[PDB]
Symmetry: C3
Subunit: 149 residues, 3 copies
């Protein structure tokens, strides 16, 4: 069975103009784009996005870094929630494995280019926060027979 | 002291049209193309290719996935049998390291893009199965002095 | 706090004509080019560079391999000394992780494409040996707000 994960290119990904490169990494595995939207993230939606960190001293700083243009995305694939995390790499780019997004593009955790859901529960919540159901698109990849066993 | 390994692009590599990208990964290390042939794999040759799994319940499914166009290849280099295995990554793409072929391109073991010999004995057997001696080409890379110590 | 490291493309990197690819890997992380110079390495400068190995039987062959065009470089970034070492990978390419320069381009330690400082002390020593201070340039990257936290 496939699943869907929420991936969001942060303002540093937009401003460094690596959006296409990021998308290509997920397309390369035959992951399907199920939703995609450019918006400007605001403090009120980011408070909900970062709800697990309510009341923590670092939350204002997380929100400030994220206040800016973002690319909201939903990708579909086998085990894609865990696999996208593996592809992003460790929170700290300096600890991330070579070949991951954060190791290949970044230096510090506060500017680590991309967010991805950390669990099935978070993916469901995040997809619902940033997308309406009518924005989630269902279609089948023509190469499905050569992607899925 | 170089050796030769058998590498085969499976039908999913052909149909997803990533043959050139795969070849480029091996050329990038200064591995030498010693043989290359496009064919359509037959059940008869695949039964011998997969002889280790004779009688196993999953063998018919393995053969069915592989009955299609394939690119047979022989690459030469230092430690190239083990090194090509490392470059392909784990059989299951989800367990493969970022930066390997299977992690970068694939989702499931049954569609994992590429075969490579797993040992010196297997390489000798597989090269002999898929190639005639007259198809194996001997020449020296002009950059040899800058590739080999 | 950023630091600076000495990175040198060896004659195999020049002759295999992958200079631009190497530079792009470091630029991709927002590391700043603080110095860059093409020269031809000579035995007298290489003897100082490899001073720790004076008298060892492998040194004459090492110096022979390194007598040729080289690209001297200084890159600046957070933790860049350790990070550049990680990006190069193990001295022996066969042991280097997928996604590192040496794993992606090389076969043997004697032709492993690139040198990088192993410590802050070595970086200071190597930058003094290979560059004049006139050659180290001070300027700020315009994307700093999106590279550094
Ligand atoms: C941006 C950032 C996030 N994180 C943590 C906060 C969340 O628990 C997790 C995912 O954050 P993210 O949604 O901003 O990618 O990473 C840090 O520890 N340091 C940072 O600098
Ligand atoms: C295709 C496939 C191969 N394998 C095993 C069978 C062989 O022992 C080994 C290499 O197979 P391969 O020649 O098809 O790459 O991988 C699996 O365990 N699962 C799979 O889905
Ligand atoms: C080129 C080379 C370097 N080295 C060691 C010597 C130095 O301690 C370290 C870095 O050397 P380098 O300046 O040539 O990169 O690598 C080997 O052990 N084997 C080799 O073939």
């Amino acid at each position: 069975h496939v699943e869907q994960t929420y991936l969001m290119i942060k303002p540093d990904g937009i401003q460094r103009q690596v959006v296409g490169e990021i998308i290509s990494r997920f397309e390369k595995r035959g992951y399907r784009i199920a939703a995609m939207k450019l918006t400007i993230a605001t403090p009120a939606i980011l408070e909900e996005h970062y709800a697990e960190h309510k009341g923590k001293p670092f939350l204002p700083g997380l929100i400030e870094k994220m206040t800016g243009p973002v690319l909201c995305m939903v990708f579909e694939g086998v085990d894609v929630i865990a696999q996208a995390r593996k592809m992003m790499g460790s929170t700290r780019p300096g600890e991330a494995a070579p070949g991951t997004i954060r190791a290949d593009f970044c230096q510090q955790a506060g500017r680590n280019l991309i967010h991805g859901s950390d669990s099935a529960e978070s993916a469901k919540r995040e997809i619902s926060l940033w997308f309406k159901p009518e924005e989630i698109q269902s279609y089948k990849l023509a190469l499905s027979d050569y992607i899925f066993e």
